[PDB]
Design a protein around this ligand. Structure first.
Ligand SMILES: *[C@](=O)([C]([C][C][C][N]C([N])=[N])[N]C(=O)[C]N1C(=O)C([N][C]C2=[C][C]=[C][C]=[C]2)=[C]N=C1S[C])C1=N[C]=[C]S1
Length: 237
């Protein structure tokens, strides 16, 4: 995350850090707990990933330093990628990770509610993007989970900033006209939480953008509310 600040421990209990053991263990992407056995993340985060066996999900983490060889984690039983996904910039950048075991909720790890179709009209004014991603290009994974408050921008305005792409209604953008605060490499799959009426909603999933925090280049996110039916279908045993 760029132009962000250190998060408070337990402040984003649905935020998880997704790790890969190949070749050696490291943070791969962010993700969000949406069910006792489900993580919602980005699809493009599984490029080159041929087996869920090399994945490790860590919940209730503030600092990457807390993660050691002993540290407990959640295995991944199945990776579910939207069948229409091709690449982040084309949309459908969403995936579900079915965990091998169930998450026991607590103050440090709990699920975030999904947006309601009737909320597609709601005006989110308190939105935050979080992650251990780059604080700048050519940077590196950060130790402490970062947070940044960023305003949502209309799809019309976003389309103007990406004339080379098609910003669909299945995407949602966020950023400052002057740039300065945004998600970056490593934040992918992360949640774009928006508190409405005392309740936090998973409005978006960190997906892509041109560079990071550049002026007139809003971050682009998967518009989660457009996938509630998909999520229900894929999670209902
Ligand atoms: C993800 O953490 C990053 C997050 C990027 C967020 N960017 C913001 N908010 N400024 N996602 C990606 O790397 C996805 N991605 C891209 O963002 C780009 N950008 C180049 C581009 C896009 C549009 C127009 C011009 C240029 C290119 N490819 C990809 S696919 C990986 C990470 N995911 C994996 C590692 S870090």
């Amino acid at each position: 995350i760029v132009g962000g600040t250190a998060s408070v421990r337990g402040e984003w209990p649905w935020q998880v850090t997704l790790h890969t053991t190949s070749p050696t263990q490291r943070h791969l992407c962010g993700g969000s707990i949406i069910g006792n056995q489900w993580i919602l993340t980005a699809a493009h985060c599984f490029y080159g990933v041929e087996s869920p066996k090399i994945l490790r999900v860590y919940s209730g983490i503030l600092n990457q330093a807390e993660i050691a060889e002993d540290t407990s984690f959640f295995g991944v039983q199945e990776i579910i990628i939207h069948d229409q996904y091709k690449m982040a910039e084309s949309g459908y950048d969403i995936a579900l990770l079915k965990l091998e075991t169930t998450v026991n909720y607590a103050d440090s790890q709990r699920p975030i509610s999904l947006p309601s179709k009737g909320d597609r009209n709601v005006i989110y004014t308190d939105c935050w993007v979080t992650g251990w991603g780059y604080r700048k290009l050519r940077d590196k994974i950060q130790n402490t989970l970062q947070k940044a408050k960023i305003p949502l921008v209309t799809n019309e305005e976003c389309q103007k900033r990406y004339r080379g792409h098609k910003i669909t209604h299945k995407m949602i953008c966020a950023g400052y006209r002057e740039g300065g605060k945004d998600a970056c490499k490593g934040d992918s799959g992360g949640p774009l939480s928006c508190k409405h009426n005392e309740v936090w909603h998973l409005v978006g999933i960190t997906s892509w953008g041109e560079g990071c925090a550049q002026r007139e280049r809003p971050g682009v996110y998967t518009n989660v509310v457009e996938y509630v039916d998909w999520i229900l279908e894929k999670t209902q045993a």
